[model samples]
Target chain A: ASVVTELRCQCLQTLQGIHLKNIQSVNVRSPGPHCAQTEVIATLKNGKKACLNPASPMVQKIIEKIL
Target chain B: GIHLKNIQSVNVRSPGPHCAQTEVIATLKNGKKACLNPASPMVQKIIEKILNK
Candidate 1:
């Protein structure tokens, strides 16, 4: 879920409602099952794609795999 | 009976607890004391939940 939509708008500008709507739509149609890792390739720049931004807790699970 | 086509999915995972992981006591054989800690954001949050509670 590290690459997901629960993103923090790092840019100074606030995302417009229309943009948010588009993002939501993209996320709704993302290819993977919820919580599953997914990657989508696109030819266009910043092409619309959905990703799961794993919460911090999920991070711990991965850490558990090592050591 | 569980078919993706027939079900409307919703995320039910809840974040209620935040606890710090117990630092791994030096138990590695051969004098290796390594602390087990979470590395990913998700796992870290879960550990935090447990510690916070």
Candidate 2:
């Protein structure tokens, strides 16, 4: 349904990266009919979530490894 | 980590004006799907193996 497509970006700001140990996993969501920029969300081990900046050099390292 | 071995599939969605981020979603052997973070080294090789496959 339309529920998956939010009205706007969940993260107003994004960070470079976080400690791998503190993270459970990460999910990258592309801009949609709603959001305009790339969104990177991380599921934290401590029961939280975070946004990672796509332009961050530290973040690009892992993406480059995949692509 | 033990996660890699548990991976069953990895899916990457390219960016677009409509949806600008390159998305990475992985399914585990258990059949649960999780959105993988690009900056996480844990999923780096997980996707490469699929992309490079």
Candidate 3:
């Protein structure tokens, strides 16, 4: 299950910075895949449960940056 | 007014001569329960802004 438990001030700051940088087409998600598991079951914006592959470059990048 | 910097210990009593009622509850979606006063306009405004976002 995907859940965001941390209260991340950095996430808000990062989003604002990205916005100021004119970055669009970004899918911001709840920080997760953190419980030593490989797969990330994401709660997609379309209100559907989708199994997300954590090995994706984007997800990896997000985890690296956020963590 | 009592001046307390680092609060460690104190006994505060409410009405009925020395008893207080404490409640831990989920008052709103946001985790700002202490700031959620009864029908607070500011909280409503914030919720509206979140919705718009």
Candidate 4:
């Protein structure tokens, strides 16, 4: 299963807050169990990447809203 | 410019031995995708908010 489907701005806003401006593209990936704690990878507009906690209530809320 | 808000969730993971370089994946309400550097000042603030809350 793909962590998530259909990328939308509203969903992005719900997860990053003002930090959203720095984002360029998002990919829902497993990265693998070898890597600890991440369900998705976000590439910033500036060519940077960030790892987020999907367990957060905010993120959970997003998941609930979507699928 | 559109600002990012209404966070839905943040998934933090260790990409390597250095937790400092850890990545954060964020999902928005509209199903859009974004990322925040855990080392970034703004990201620090966001993580703090989530932890404090």
DockQ of each: 0.03, 0.06, 0.02, 0.03
DockQ, candidate 4, vs. native dimer: 0.03
By TM-score, highest first, what's the ranking? 2, 4, 3, 1
Q: What are the chain A TM-scores of the candidates, in order?
A: 0.18, 0.75, 0.31, 0.45
Worst 10 residues of 1 chain A by lDDT: A23-32
Give the per-residue lDDT of model 4 (tens digit) for A1-67.
5565444332232234315545544444322322333454556666776554555666434322222
lDDT (10s digit) by residue, model 3, range B1-53 = 11122111111111132323321112222323222232334433332222222
- lDDT per residue, candidate 1, B1-53, as tens digits? 22222222112111123523323221222334334332334434432333222
Q: Rate the local accuracy (lDDT) of all candidates.
A: 0.27, 0.61, 0.27, 0.48
Candidate 3 regions with alpha-carbon error over 4 angstroms: A1-37, A63-67, B1-53
Candidate 1 TM-score over all chains jointly: 0.16
Residue lDDT tens for model 2, B1-53 = 43766665555554545666767777676768878775666667654443333
> Candidate 3, residues A3-39: lDDT per residue as tens digits?
7766332221111112112211122222223222233
What value does DockQ give for candidate 1? 0.03
Give candidate 4 regions above 4 Å deviation. A1-67, B1-4, B17-21
lDDT of 3 at A36: 28
Candidate 2 docking quality: incorrect, acceptable, medium or high:
incorrect
Span of ten consecutive residues with least summed lDDT in model 4 chain A: A9-18
Q: Tell me, per candidate, how large a share of the native contacts it keeps.
A: 0.00, 0.00, 0.00, 0.00
Q: Candidate 2 lDDT, tens digit per residue, A1-67?
A: 4555348787987776587656555555544444676666767667798887866767655445333
- Ranking of candidates on DockQ, top first: 2, 4, 1, 3
RMSD of 1: 18.7
Off by over 4 Å in 1: A1-67, B15-53
